[PDB]
Amino acid sequence: MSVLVYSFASFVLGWCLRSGITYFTRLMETSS
Amino acid sequence: ADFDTIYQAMIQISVVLCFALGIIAGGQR
């Protein structure tokens, strides 16, 4: 289960890092 | 070269693919 846990953690890390950009861009765009 | 060599390389390839798929999934508005 070790490689599954760490591979899944890598996927969640990637979503979290990029989602911060997506939310910032979307909020600022609809804000103006 | 050795089974351990293939095992370690495969694991490192897996995490870097999962990160790339994570970026693609997170960039979907």
Binding site: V12, C16, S19, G20, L27, S31 | -
Partner: protein, 46 residues
């Protein structure tokens, strides 16, 4: 969870972004409605 720290960072970052958005919305909407009302009232006031 090895990526719980990443989620916690995103959560603290999101609440900051929402504050930024509301601040910019208020200033843009305020100017837009203000200019529109000014033109409307001056025409009605002849």
């Amino acid at each position: 969870d090895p990526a719980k720290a990443a989620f916690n960072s995103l959560q603290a970052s999101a609440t900051e972004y929402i504050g930024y958005a509301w601040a910019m919305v208020v200033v843009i909407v305020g100017a837009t409605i203000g200019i529109k009302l000014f033109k409307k009232f001056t025409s009605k006031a002849s």
